[PDB]
Design a binder for this molecule. Structure first.
Ligand SMILES: COC(=O)N1CCN(c2ccc(F)cc2)CC1
Ligand SMILES: COC(=O)N1CCN(c2ccc(F)cc2)CC1
Lengths: 269, 268
């Protein structure tokens, strides 16, 4: 991987592995999500930021401040097959008082065609209290020299799907998968549940008949609270709709505290 | 990756990814196990065998025959750090009536030092009945041209750790993790639980204090029965000692055994 010529974006190629593919012999959406985080980490490494997933500066580390994902939105047109080469380009931008954004474009290396795109919203928070706090000008200024100044959006449309408000699923859910819990492989280097694990958990409550006859086109996931290493999660889904759409909710098995909400859109094969 | 000059082995390099590392910022043993299966798959692809994990021929597919792992044994001296390049060489050999073997050697690309080694035993079985069945001469002859003729062992020594018999853990277990179940990411392209998932499940019942103060040096795992997509598993561990453990994976309900194993950990 490498920074591009203008140094305002980062590109990396990946060859799809045998264990990375699903029943369609193409990369799963969780494999794609892992690759997005990977190219994000390599971008941070390339310009001197932390590589722990929080992409911090020395100033933020003295204050115990971190960047955390508030929303992930992925749209895939073609999943790459086993052995194919996928090229991923990523960039960041500041969105002032609202927080920050990281975007991605996925392309087939052989044809140069755009096979998918993704966007994510980030907020700043004290890692100990979990209280949000607005970025100071001195912290922000250190990042702006690595971002394009003119708007560069993977999702330019004014009322596009990536910004839609997601409602809260009401009981009873149409489908459920209960008692889900993370194992050590679901944790990162600092013992936090990897953001991709929550994608896998949302999808566990999709009926297998849908997975067998449809392909996932869009997933939007809001991140409200983290699931700790010793927590247990319930995954709930209700059909909201040749296309199928679902409303999703992840909550703690016991008291029902919400950790994530989302929506998915599937197209018939 | 590529076949070597004599065409009797396969080599591939991997750069360790950010999500592949544990709390030590080095590759987890499950990441290593995934890489071993990956280089195995690329070796099969390179010479025309199936790439579904069963490494079959057209003749075996007509008979619904598959190769299945009976034992995996891995020894790691140094786990590769995030961003390091690890080179892995793999080869196969027939062991006649006992079954077959696939070996691996892991090396640090920069120094050329051996950082780990692994071996696995395989048996042939009918995919539908799960009955064992001996390899016919016509089936085995198609594989021998891709294997070294002289013995080439990652663990050459007579009666070494890789061939030791593993006993069955007796109740009560010292430690347990119950109600483990696979999610879609634990399944392969054919909807079977990936062999690496069973490694993760064995390790779930190791106390976190051991993981925090020790490094896994050796893992030997026998594979007795497949955990289906809708099965639920209990992971049991008892200290037998460096720290050593006896492990057992069994179905949550009736206690049917699916795996047994041992691990050896070195203080950091
Ligand atoms: C792993 O973290 C990220 O990918 N992000 C997204 C980009 N971020 C950012 C911060 C300040 C700014 F002015 C512009 C962008 C930081 C968090
Ligand atoms: C994924 O499967 C493997 O890795 N295997 C199984 C098949 N193997 C083999 C080796 C020599 C032989 F004569 C017949 C079969 C051993 C390696």
């Amino acid at each position: 991987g490498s920074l591009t010529e203008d140094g305002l974006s980062y590109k990396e190629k990946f060859v799809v592995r045998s264990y990375e593919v699903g029943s369609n012999k193409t990369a799963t959406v969780e494999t794609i999500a892992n690759l997005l985080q990977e190219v994000g980490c390599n971008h941070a490494q390339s310009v001197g930021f932390s590589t722990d997933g929080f992409a911090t500066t020395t100033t933020m580390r003295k204050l115990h401040l971190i960047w955390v994902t508030a929303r992930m939105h992925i749209e895939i047109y073609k999943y790459p097959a086993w052995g194919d080469v996928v090229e991923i380009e990523t960039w960041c931008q500041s969105e002032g008082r609202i927080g920050t954004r990281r975007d991605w474009i996925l392309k087939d290396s052989v044809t140069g065609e755009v096979t998918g795109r993704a966007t994510s919203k980030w907020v700043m928070m004290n890692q100990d209290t979990r209280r949000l706090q607005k970025v100071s000008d001195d912290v922000r200024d250190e990042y702006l020299v690595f971002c394009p100044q003119e708007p560069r959006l993977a999702f330019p449309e004014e009322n596009n799907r990536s910004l839609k408000k997601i409602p809260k699923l009401e009981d009873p859910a149409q489908y459920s998968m209960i008692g889900l819990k993370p194992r050590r492989a679901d944790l990162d280097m600092n013992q936090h549940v990897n953001n991709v694990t929550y994608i896998g958990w949302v999808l566990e409550s999709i009926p297998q008949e849908i997975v067998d006859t449809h392909e996932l086109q869009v997933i939007t996931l809001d991140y409200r609270r983290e699931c700790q290493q010793d927590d247990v999660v319930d995954s709930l889904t209700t059909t909201t709709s040749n296309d199928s759409q679902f409303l999703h909710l992840l909550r703690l098995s016991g008291d029902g505290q919400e950790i994530n909400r989302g929506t998915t859109l599937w197209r018939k094969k």
